[PDB]
């Protein structure tokens, strides 16, 4: 078989080989092995090897085959060292540097992770959600130095079914709650994923509307926020549909502020911002002209539109590490910024 295959085969998880998060000195390296485990690993399950002394000399050709590389810079292959695997999957920038008084400030080194998703919901008048699920992605930009093998570990959480960019190694998701992988430069998708089961509602519509004869038509709807108190949800839309027949309007809200757009034949309020744990109410009277003959139908859900600062999936991330073989920097020398953005698609209550 090929070089690249055999590796890939301690990759999975469930392999033979044992692969750890090992501590040297101040540093700890990520997903590492120890260069013996590979020798053994390498005859007791790999055929074809007459006797142990050619297990190793495989394994050294793993090394300069670069399959496999070497935790601290050394030429020749030790047994008694650790090692972290190379990029099994299938252009050089002049690099920053902190600006000092006249001064040479260590190189730039720092990465971005945003966790984006967008929840759909279509809950019913009474609270009843009917569809619920949340469409996510994790995108991150890259700015390392090299090619650092790194590790990336969040919370576990019902996550439904998901796909990973090429450079990420064959992690378990069930048992590790992390995955491996070496960094392309630059900005990517490093994974995608949808989740339906245990998801935030941000907010909560309680809808309202009474009819008083033909003209009239009364309509109290209220907005909770749902999650800490903390935390803002900004630039917030709610819609609410008027009949066709509508002839005058009347809105009332303490907060934001509430158009009628007839245009649409709907009222647009837009609320600047809103903390958690809270209500807001917005009331308004429908005037409505003598229906004669109108179309066929029941109405259109309330849709709302928003931002919230966090994973509506319940997803939140623990950890990357970020360590360089070749290079010297680890974690202390990486500068890492998150930052989740949760936004809102089919976001609609039954009226």
Request: proline share 6%.
């Amino acid at each position: 078989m090929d070089m690249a295959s055999v590796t890939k085969a301690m990759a999975a998880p469930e392999s033979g080989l044992e692969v750890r998060d090992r501590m040297w000195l101040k540093i700890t390296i990520p997903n590492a092995f120890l260069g013996s485990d590979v020798v053994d690993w390498l005859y007791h399950h790999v055929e074809g090897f007459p006797e142990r002394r050619e297990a190793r000399k495989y394994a050294s050709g793993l090394l300069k085959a670069g399959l496999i590389r070497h935790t601290v810079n050394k030429i020749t292959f030790s047994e008694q060292c650790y090692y972290v695997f190379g990029d099994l999957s299938g252009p050089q920038p002049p690099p920053y540097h902190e600006l000092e008084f006249g001064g040479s400030g260590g190189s730039r080194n720092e990465l971005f992770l945003d966790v984006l998703e967008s929840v759909n919901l279509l809950m019913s008048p009474q609270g009843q959600v009917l569809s619920a699920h949340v469409s996510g992605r994790v995108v991150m930009k890259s700015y390392l130095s090299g090619m650092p093998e790194c590790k990336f570990g969040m919370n576990d959480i019902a996550i439904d079914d998901c796909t990973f960019h090429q450079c990420v190694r064959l992690s378990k998701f069930d048992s590790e709650r992390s995955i491996s992988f070496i960094p392309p430069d630059g900005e990517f998708e490093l994974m995608r994923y949808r989740t339906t089961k245990d998801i935030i509602l941000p907010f909560r519509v309680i809808p309202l509307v009474r009819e008083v004869g033909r003209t009239k038509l009364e309509v109290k709807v209220v907005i909770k926020s749902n999650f800490k108190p903390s935390l803002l949800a900004q630039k917030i839309e709610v819609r609410i549909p008027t009949p066709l027949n509508t002839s005058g309007v009347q809105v009332i809200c303490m907060k934001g502020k509430a158009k009628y757009k007839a245009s649409e034949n709907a009222i647009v309020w837009k609320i600047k911002r809103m903390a958690g744990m809270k209500e807001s109410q917005i009331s308004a009277e429908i005037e409505l002209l003598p229906t004669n003959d109108k179309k066929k139908w029941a109405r259109p859900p309330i849709s709302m539109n928003f931002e919230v600062p966090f994973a509506p999936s319940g997803l939140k991330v623990r950890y990357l590490k970020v360590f360089e073989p070749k290079l010297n920097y680890s974690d202390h020398d990486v500068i890492k910024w998150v930052r989740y953005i949760g936004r809102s698609g089919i976001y609609e209550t039954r009226c």
